[PDB]
Amino acid sequence: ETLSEHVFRKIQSAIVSGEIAPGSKISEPELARTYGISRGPLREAIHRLEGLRLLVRVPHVGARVVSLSHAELIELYEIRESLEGMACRLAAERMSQAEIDELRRVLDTHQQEGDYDFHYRIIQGSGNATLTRMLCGELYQLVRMYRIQYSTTPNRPRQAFAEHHRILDAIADRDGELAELLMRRHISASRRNIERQL
Amino acid sequence: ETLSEHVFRKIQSAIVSGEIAPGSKISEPELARTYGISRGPLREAIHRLEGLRLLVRVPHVGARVVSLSHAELIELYEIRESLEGMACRLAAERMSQAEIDELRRVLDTHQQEGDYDFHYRIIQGSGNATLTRMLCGELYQLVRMYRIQYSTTPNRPRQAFAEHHRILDAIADRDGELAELLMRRHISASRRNIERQL
Numbered sequence: 239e240t241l242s243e244h245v246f247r248k249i250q251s252a253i254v255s256g257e258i259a260p261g262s263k264i265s266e267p268e269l270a271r272t273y274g275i276s277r278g279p280l281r282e283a284i285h286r287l288e289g290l291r292l293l294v295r296v297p298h299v300g301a302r303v304v305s306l307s308h309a310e311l312i313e314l315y316e317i318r319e320s321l322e323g324m325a326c327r328l329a330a331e332r333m334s335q336a337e338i339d340e341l342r343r344v345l346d347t348h349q350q351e352g353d354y355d356f357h358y359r360i361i362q363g364s365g366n367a368t369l370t371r372m373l374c375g376e377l378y379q380l381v382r383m384y385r386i387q388y389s390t391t392p393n394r395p396r397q398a399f400a401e402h403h404r405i406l407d408a409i410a411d412r413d414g415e416l417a418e419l420l421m422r423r424h425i426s427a428s429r430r431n432i433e434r435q436l
Numbered sequence: 437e438t439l440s441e442h443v444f445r446k447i448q449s450a451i452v453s454g455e456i457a458p459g460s461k462i463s464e465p466e467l468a469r470t471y472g473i474s475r476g477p478l479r480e481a482i483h484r485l486e487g488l489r490l491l492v493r494v495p496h497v498g499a500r501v502v503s504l505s506h507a508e509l510i511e512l513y514e515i516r517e518s519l520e521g522m523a524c525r526l527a528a529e530r531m532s533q534a535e536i537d538e539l540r541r542v543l544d545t546h547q548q549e550g551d552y553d554f555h556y557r558i559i560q561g562s563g564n565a566t567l568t569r570m571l572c573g574e575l576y577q578l579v580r581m582y583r584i585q586y587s588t589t590p591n592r593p594r595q596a597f598a599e600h601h602r603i604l605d606a607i608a609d610r611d612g613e614l615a616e617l618l619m620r621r622h623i624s625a626s627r628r629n630i631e632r633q634l
């Protein structure tokens with residue numbers, strides 16, 4: 239990898255983890271001193287970081303960490319509902335029986351840690367590389383910094399496991415229509431859970 | 437912008453336009469001489485270009501322009517159906533009456549040029565910035581290099597205008613469910629039109 243890519247993921251991880259507070263003023267000088275890179279590759283990283291809605295550009299000031307507002311949550315979970323739901327539909331037709339059985343194995347294994355492995359197996363089982371990039375590469379970063387800033391309720395881990403199993407049941411039955419619907423409801427339950435603390 | 441961003445869009449435009457043939461071996465030396473940049477920022481551009489499925493990485497060789505195969509078309513138009521269809525649903529509830537009337541004005545205005553403005557107004561009318569980036573910033577680049585490599589049939593421009601107007605009619609009636617369905621059918625008609633020459 240190049241240095242421009244190194245400082246990218248180091249800053250991106252500091253934003254998703256809350257290390258840099260949502261809404262902070264990003265100081266390009268003190269950041270170039272923390273990692274020791276010139277302003278060329280640094281501005282290259284901020285531009286990408288603004289593209290993924292992690293940083294936001296202010297005209298007369300500079301870059302700022304995203305507001306982490308309610309409108310941005312609607313924007314994010316909307317796309318995630320349409321994409322993950324379709325991932326369940328495609329995974330139900332395209333997953334081999336070996337991938338399905340391994341999916342139940344992963345689910346049988348079980349702030350909050352979460353079950354990203356469950357969703358990741360389905361997105362991969364959908365057989366769409368572009369879908370995997372848009373979900374796990376772009377959307378899931380802004381998703382995580384919401385779940386990190388706002389912890390779930392103590393009954394949410396139990397509720398999501400039930401939702402996960404019924405989704406798996408529809409996928410294992412080759413019922414993409416039901417799996418897509420069950421996936422959508424589970425995404426909407428996740429958004430309402432986060433909307434409980436704003 | 438930085439130089440790393442300049443050579444990015446210059447190569448990306450040379451791929452979408454067919455200037456660089458689909459499936460060609462990208463020569464990092466002769467490319468670094470064409471634009472005059474070091475291998476650091478050059479490798480930075482190829483990495484992003486591979487992310488958007490424009491270049492593909494070969495282990496023991498290097499980077500190659502995407503195969504432009506049939507499987508990649510299915511991968512691409514799948515995501516476009518789910519995203520653009522949802523864009524029509526959201527645009528039907530969220531577009532102001534001024535944006536709708538202006539949408540009919542744009543449609544009333546009318547290889548092939550295409551009606552990207554029509555789709556762009558709807559994606560913007562959806563009120564989702566992430567949706568606009570994923571559609572117009574990532575997917576629509578790989579879309580264009582398919583429509584450039586494979587020209588439509590002479591009756592396709594006429595057929596798409598009818599599809600566009602019925603979509604506009606459902607949006608102007610605040611019928612997101614019908615607009616989404618009509619949008620999906622029009623996306624599927626576009627894919628079959630391209631599938632006619634492979």
Ligand SMILES: C[C@](O)(C(=O)O)[C@H](CC(=O)O)C(=O)O
Pocket residue numbers: 351352353354356357385390394395398399427428429431
């Ligand atoms: C636990 C979870 O199901 C997950 O898969 O990580 C969560 C649910 C939630 O946060 O309410 C998710 O999918 O976002």
Ligand SMILES: C[C@](O)(C(=O)O)[C@H](CC(=O)O)C(=O)O
Pocket residue numbers: 549550551552554555583588592593596597625626627629
């Ligand atoms: C003409 C078109 O409707 C367009 O909006 O550019 C095309 C249709 C097609 O290519 O068959 C499109 O949307 O892809």
Ligand SMILES: [Zn+2]
Pocket residue numbers: 353357398402424
């Ligand atoms: Zn979950």
Ligand SMILES: [Zn+2]
Pocket residue numbers: 551555596600622
């Ligand atoms: Zn069209």
